[PDB]
């Protein structure tokens, strides 16, 4: 635990079909020594173990519907949900693998309501 | 289809042990490393480490290395985390998590989870 992934919001509350945006923001830069940025973005629905969505900051990872997105710089990332359906429903978490020990953001809780 | 199946949830009293197992199929159990993360209560997940399931060699993070301990049964494909003298501080549910290509640097396929529960 050294390198904190800071999350905003905390709370998400939403509705259907809105858009929604999670920022994460790291304490340090996250550049591999193989300059790749490991940045991704994990859902865990309620019930399930987390799931990833994002990886590499930006790529969409198998199955992962078109409406997420990742983007961001060197300290600061953000995950979009062009529009929000009831399978979104969910904690949100983003993660850096470039630097060990690899740390997570402490979730966003996204709800519809 | 990568499969990581856990044990059931566990209920434990001060001071005793518990052991976890992650089954893997699927795939060949040495070719990677395995991975486990602690989700607290609340929802925060803190890496505790890494077994190297080839040499069977643990790796730590943040103090994680005094009571945790990493073991493997190859011929089972089946990965175990034990903890000893449980505390109030580890109840949460403990996954295993396996990578992409063994680098440690995306996790792809998580376990079901085991929700370990320190009572009175
Ligand atoms: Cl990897």
């Known amino acids: 635990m050294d390198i904190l992934m800071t999350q905003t919001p905390l709370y998400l509350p939403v509705s259907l079909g809105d858009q929604a945006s999670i920022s994460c923001r790291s304490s340090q830069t996250i550049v591999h020594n193989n300059g790749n940025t490991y940045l991704e973005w994990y859902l865990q629905k309620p019930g399930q173990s987390p799931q990833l969505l994002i990886y590499?900051?930006?790529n969409r990872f198998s199955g992962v519907p078109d409406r997420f997105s990742g983007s961001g710089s060197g300290t600061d990332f953000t995950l979009k949900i062009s529009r929000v359906e009831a399978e979104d429903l969910g904690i949100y978490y983003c993660f850096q693998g470039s630097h060990f020990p690899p740390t997570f953001g402490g979730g966003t809780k996204l709800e519809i309501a | 289809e990568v499969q990581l199946q856990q044990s059931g949830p566990e209920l434990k009293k001060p001071g005793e042990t518990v052991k976890i197992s992650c089954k893997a199929t699927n795939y060949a159990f040495t070719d990677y490393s395995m991975h486990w993360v602690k989700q607290a209560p609340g929802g925060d997940l803190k890496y505790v480490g890494w077994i190297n399931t080839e040499t069977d060699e643990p790796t730590f993070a943040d103090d994680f290395k005094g009571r945790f301990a990493f073991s493997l049964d190859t011929s089972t494909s089946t990965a175990f985390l034990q903890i000893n003298n449980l505390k109030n501080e580890d109840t949460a549910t403990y996954f295993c998590?396996?990578?992409?290509?063994?680098?440690?640097?995306?996790?792809?396929?998580w376990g079901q989870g085991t929700t370990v529960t320190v009572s009175a």
């Open positions: 998590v396996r990578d992409r290509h063994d680098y440690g640097e995306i996790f792809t396929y």
């Open positions: 590499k900051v930006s």
